[PDB]
Amino acid sequence: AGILADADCAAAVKACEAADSFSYKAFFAKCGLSGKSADDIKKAFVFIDQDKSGFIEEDELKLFLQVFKAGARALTDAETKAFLKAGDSDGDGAIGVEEWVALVKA
């Protein structure tokens, strides 16, 4: 946990410390992931894909904050729901590497 921690993304985590305060656009504006290399954006995807399915499922989405900081809170079910819906364009209920790359963007 906190394997992808840096000042910015730590600050994004801190900004949604309270339950139901998170929105992925605001997070990523603070956590400059989009600004990274396409390789470095995929690496974050595989970090989050904790079961190695090749896809990020809602259960891993839940744990998104912990990837950027240790002891972070899990996303609430409603948060996880809203973030999945935003990222899952093909509607299989999962986020693929292409859907990831889209989602990260400003």
Q: Which residue has the tokens 């986020």?
A: 95
Tokens (6 digits) for 60: 């891993």
Q: Which of 20, 40, 90, 98 binds Ca ion (CB under 5 A)?
A: 90
> Does residue number 100 form part of the binding site for Ca ion (CB under 5 A)?
no
CA dihedral 23, 18, 80, 71 (to 10 degrees): 120
Position 40 contacts Ca ion (CB under 5 A): no
Which residues, 46 to 65, sit near Ca ion by CB under 5 A? 49, 51, 53, 55, 57
If one asks whether residue 103 binds Ca ion (CB under 5 A), the answer comes out as no
Where residue 91 falls (left for φ over 0; alpha for ψ -120 to 50; beta otherwise) is: left
Residue number closest to Ca ion, CB atom: 53
DSSP three-state, residue 27: helix
CB of 80 to Ca ion, least distance (A): 14
Eight-state DSSP code of residue 6: -
Give the interface segment with Ca ion, choosing from 12-20, 34-42, 66-74, 83-91 (CB under 5 A).
Answer: 83-91
Cα 32 off chain centre by: 12
The binding site comprises 49, 51, 53, 55, 57, 60, 88, 90, 92, 94, 99
